[PDB]
Amino acid sequence: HLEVLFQGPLGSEFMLPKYAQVKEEISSWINQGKILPDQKIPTENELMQQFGVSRHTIRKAIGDLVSQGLLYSVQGGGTFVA
Amino acid sequence: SEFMLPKYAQVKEEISSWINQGKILPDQKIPTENELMQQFGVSRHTIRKAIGDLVSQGLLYSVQGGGTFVA
DNA sequence: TATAATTAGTACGTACAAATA
DNA sequence: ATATTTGTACGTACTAATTAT
């Protein structure tokens, strides 16, 4: 189902960018143990759909989390909790 | 094939080489994204991929509207 | 003092390749 | 061998922060 990236500002103790909201959410899944090490997160398509954002935005978020070391990716395979 | 690298990775290598050879020193600005785009003949996205990786790696840092610098 | 220009940031999109399932 | 999925590369349009006029 659907997750809200809540609609954005230009002046109110600023909201995170959408990619950063996605980062926080996915990170939350890991931290709350909704996803375990070496378990697969949803596909980029699924994430696009459920967060209501572009593939670009999803890849920005996931790329950041991979560089932080709590996700890893395999081309054609998936993205998994580290 | 054995020698092939994606464009963003070749850009990464070159900028890194600038840093490593001390051609660009800490807190000195690297060229703009436009300048890199022109110098390498690639898209702005590819440049940002390169630089983003190098920042994430700690080699560079960026200031929006300011520039990107040797860390 | 205040604008315009420059420059990096965010975010939507397409197209195709490469690796996996 | 097909379909799925992540990777590479590019396009386009703005915004936000800094810099120069």
Side-chain angles (χ1 to χ4, degrees), chain A residues 2-82, chain B residues 2-71:
Chain A
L2 162 156
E3 284 89 47
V4 283
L5 305 186
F6 57 104
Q7 315 331 136
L10 169 154
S12 158
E13 198 277 321
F14 324 104
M15 270 181 221
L16 293 168
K18 288 173 191 297
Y19 77 84
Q21 291 179 53
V22 174
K23 281 174 66 176
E24 282 190 348
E25 189 76 284
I26 295 175
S27 295
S28 192
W29 299 344
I30 296 173
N31 183 263
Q32 286 171 18
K34 291 182 171 180
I35 330 187
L36 298 179
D38 298 319
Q39 290 184 344
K40 176 197 143 296
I41 69 171
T43 71
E44 285 176 2
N45 270 230
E46 284 165 347
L47 292 171
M48 296 170 57
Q49 291 180 334
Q50 296 162 15
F51 280 116
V53 306
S54 70
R55 181 161 183 232
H56 172 99
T57 289
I58 295 303
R59 284 192 63 78
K60 171 58 161 148
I62 287 177
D64 281 8
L65 294 178
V66 167
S67 99
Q68 289 174 32
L70 40 75
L71 298 177
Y72 63 88
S73 296
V74 183
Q75 210 179 305
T79 299
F80 310 84
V81 172
Chain B
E2 329 87 57
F3 313 111
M4 186 43 177
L5 280 185
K7 290 175 177 172
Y8 72 86
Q10 301 183 47
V11 171
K12 279 175 66 183
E13 282 186 320
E14 258 308 289
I15 298 170
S16 284
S17 77
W18 298 342
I19 307 320
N20 172 248
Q21 296 166 15
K23 290 186 176 310
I24 316 189
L25 288 200
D27 294 324
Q28 290 180 335
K29 213 197 58 178
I30 70 176
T32 70
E33 293 177 348
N34 281 2
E35 284 168 351
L36 294 170
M37 285 163 66
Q38 149 191 311
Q39 285 167 2
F40 289 96
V42 299
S43 65
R44 194 178 163 209
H45 279 293
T46 289
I47 293 306
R48 290 189 57 76
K49 166 66 166 161
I51 288 173
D53 279 6
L54 290 181
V55 165
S56 186
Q57 183 183 313
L59 204 60
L60 306 174
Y61 66 92
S62 298
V63 184
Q64 173 167 174
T68 304
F69 308 85
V70 183

